[model samples]
Target chain A: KTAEAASQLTDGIGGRAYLNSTGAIFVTKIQLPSSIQVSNGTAYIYSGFSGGTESDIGFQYSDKYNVWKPYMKVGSKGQDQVQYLEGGSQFTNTKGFRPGSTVQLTIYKNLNGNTRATYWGTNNAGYNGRLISEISKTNVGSISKWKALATVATTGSRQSIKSNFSTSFTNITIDNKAITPVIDTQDFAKVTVSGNSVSLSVVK
Target chain B: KTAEAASQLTDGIGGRAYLNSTGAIFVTKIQLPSSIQVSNGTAYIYSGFSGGTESDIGFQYSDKYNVWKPYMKVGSKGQDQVQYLEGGSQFTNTKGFRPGSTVQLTIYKNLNGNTRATYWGTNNAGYNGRLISEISKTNVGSISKWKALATVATTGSRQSIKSNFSTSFTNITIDNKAITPVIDTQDFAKVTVSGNSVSLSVVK
Candidate 1:
């Protein structure tokens, strides 16, 4: 059966992970237009852009298991690219993601070791999905190789793209014309364009 | 229709409240026997002994609207004697205080006004009811007139009662038998009777 969430909306969003002055890790939330879509690979409420051929980080659903799980994609689509996090019935409630949901995704450094990513979704205003996915060392930790790089791109119409990194990108298109982002970020933040409103939030 | 929780076990219970040096309030949970039953009056989950005509301080539920409301039973059965707090729907989920369900009752000192009481129930560890009821000053607050005097009394077979006061109290009962409590209060604390276990906790 097609995952119910497969029909929901998706976003082309991305951000960089950084530690605050207090040594706490923070992954930015780059907002995308409501026009963005992730190939309905399966019904799942997800946010965040791909980093590489197989590498990705965001929220996903398992229609077979009828649950939601956190995911960190890497390499290629081969079996070795995904690291799974725990949530759902093999864990908590039976509730999974569905259509018309608002999702929030974050990638942060764990205190013990590797980088961690977790996501939650709300439909209307009710909690639809929540889980902290598997944790593994990938290109997601530290700020040396990706301190200032951030981008939000898709593969194609439904062609699964990679990475949300860009140093300086400008211009905004709402409903129709080109406009400027309402909120601009200098550090680790993101932007979302809706109707005629563009908002920027610095994640760090 | 019979409630989903009508097939679970119920416990007759009560508890007291205390404040630490930091002025933060802490309410303790007292365990009762599995054979316990609260009179199930007017289809509400209640605490506080039914004194005289109607005087009482406890939490309640209304099956009509599927809500758990706060109630302070005063003087008589008339409207003036009963002050209603909010309930499950306007508060939280319903499914509370039905037959065969385990209920937890607590009376605590609010930060702002009147002495307050609230309750929740679970069937086989499943939440059937949750929502803090009304807040009225029927006598729950900083231990001034009630700081050091604490007592635990049963209202007949299955009558609920409330009082989160008292620096100390003696005596213990287990499974309907008066046994000694394993935990003793050397400083400021209260006591309760479990199936075969008695415990005393001293509030900081």
Candidate 2:
């Protein structure tokens, strides 16, 4: 009967960092605006469009699977990170970052009985990828345990991913290697986080 | 100015036979109504569709070339004549003629300048061919001649004929061998003459 809300940032600085009273960082309020507006089947991102970041993110629910899922803004011509080495060594010189490309990652949130909308990046992709952070209740019958998940979309040869979100869209194998989030140069170019919500920029 | 009339079909029976008083069978009035029609861009035939006939036909003028060009509704899918009679000989099997095809080859009388609407069949194609018929005047400077020409639209293979008619669609070569009217069994399938006019049935 009452409204559900996330714990406010520890530092109390909206778009910067979010930490619980116990100093545990659960969500990073991506300092940005609702840059991307979706209507009539198209996601139109506003100007000052950069992608996303890991330390900053947004949230949503997966109505199709009845779970909470987090996705990142994968492509929007942002900065890149370095490849890692043994004992965490790293190097730069990343490719695949081109200007004028835009992409955003979002998740469906059920509002009422058969109604839903998406939530994601509200900013630009300056560089690196912005893998968004999302949290939701464990069961529809009860808003109990909260868990975090990472959402991502790859670039290069654009992926046919989002179309796989329907309840009827099933039994399909992705038949590809698993994607593990690595803190590298190309990461910053992924999404732009804004507001208390981080925007995971994507290139469709 | 007084209206110019074509040579009269004698018997004076509107939907029967006609003559010139000297009674030379100048024309035979077919039993169908003046059903097929035309307008700015499309021809809407009335019923029992078929394109045209060789011996019996309808008529038009070439305002640009200032001459009378005669045409015939050759193939509304009755039967294709031998492919190379002048060389060898061949025939193709085709059928399927029915009502609602509504194809009528009509000529614009240019009465007050550009207007009006015919008899084609009310049936569907029973084959694979029915070359359509159509014509336009080259100049609107005058309207004098009213000769009989055949209009057609072969059923199956929607040919791109026509489109050749111009303001003065004359002096052009059809390239194919000449068509001479013959009174044969298939002749009745072409079109029947009615009143002072002839109707060319077709398939739309």
Candidate 3:
């Protein structure tokens, strides 16, 4: 199924897994395809789901601006609020990531219990990556799931995620423990799972 | 001395006090003047002063828009970030309050230790008012002071507060206990202290 068809079949197009722990650090390293296209869509690695509510943190690709930035989303399906950490006319000082780069995304609860979504480039779990963005929010409730998704309808009508697009999330960990995610597809996107890595691509 | 003169003489215009408790709720009732003009300036009630850093929450009057809105500012003196709760080309869905009305502003650390600044209209400490705006941020550090101020330069060159401008903050409390605040003012703005209420007005 194309991303548009997947949008018609499900609330969103992505792979998600129920988490085994609450308030634990969810980290993933994502390698972007040399060339990817979402047109007017967004793709991100996120976590936290509850009673139709989600508190998500990670890196997001906003095709409208052709920019990769760190972002966090909180609230329910229809009334969610997303805060982009960098770029645009408002928050002009912060920097964005380069396209086709390997980056690390992390979501964790700080000592104050607020959820922070951080982005790193050219760094790893053992060494601090050059910090790109760190955005936080209070009273997000408890997050209990993690997901990597591409959606045509963050707002407005569904659109197609252009063909030949692919991305992979590797080195998945929850509190530093590796875990495998179940493959999920909506026909248009092929999902391949191997060890601690998962790949999603446009079906041939 | 005029507000402009006071700007040259002091760091800001208005009054402030050192807080006796940490992480406690700071609440104040502010009655706006019938006609207030900041003219390229900002007026607000705020709290949390650190080593040249501050986390402030309260109602802010921005003359650029000629609107009164709830806002929160966090960070150092020169590089602070301020988020207005309502009424802008960006955050269009939220509402702003009337210019000459009385409003309640609150700054407190939530259960998560993240600081929240909330604005209420036609409400009191004893009853929930119409929530105008509620903004929060994490890791804002401990706030140890409270202030009511009008600044000519939240950015750019210092400006004068238009003549006949005045505002009063009453029923001041920390952790629900009524407390008095000492008066501090630049010569252009008069500071009147009485009981738990403090008033600032353009000096004749």
The candidate scoring highest on lDDT is: 3
Give the CAPRI class of candidate 2. Answer: incorrect
lDDT of each: 0.33, 0.22, 0.52
Which model is ahead, 1 or 3, in terms of lDDT? 3
| Models sorted by lDDT, best on top | 3, 1, 2
Across A20-104, the per-residue lDDT of candidate 2 in tens digits comes to: 1211122221222222221112111111111111121222222233222232221221122211221111111222111222224
Task: Residues B28-107, candidate 3: write the lDDT tens digits.
Answer: 88786667755544565444433323555555565555545555555532113344344233321233455667777777
* Per-residue C-alpha lDDT of model 1 across residues B4-27, encoded as one tens digit per residue: 111222222333322212122323
lDDT of 1 by residue, A173-198 (tens): 21223333233222334655453233
Better of 1 and 2 by lDDT: 1
lDDT of 3 by residue, A1-204 (tens): 122111244433454433344435778887765565555445654444333235555555655544455555555211134443432322212334545668777766442545555566621111224442333345555555556553333453344433346677889887888877665444457677787777776432
DockQ of each: 0.01, 0.00, 0.01
Per-residue lDDT of candidate 2, residues B14-120 (tens digit): 11111122111121222222233211122211111111211222322232322222222222321122121110110112211121222333332222432111222
Give the interface RMSD of each candidate: 14.7, 25.1, 10.2
The TM-scores, one per candidate, come to: 0.27, 0.16, 0.44
Candidate 2 regions with alpha-carbon error over 4 angstroms: A1-164, A167-204, B1-54, B57-204
Which candidate has the highest TM-score of all?
3
* Superior by TM-score: candidate 1 or candidate 3: 3
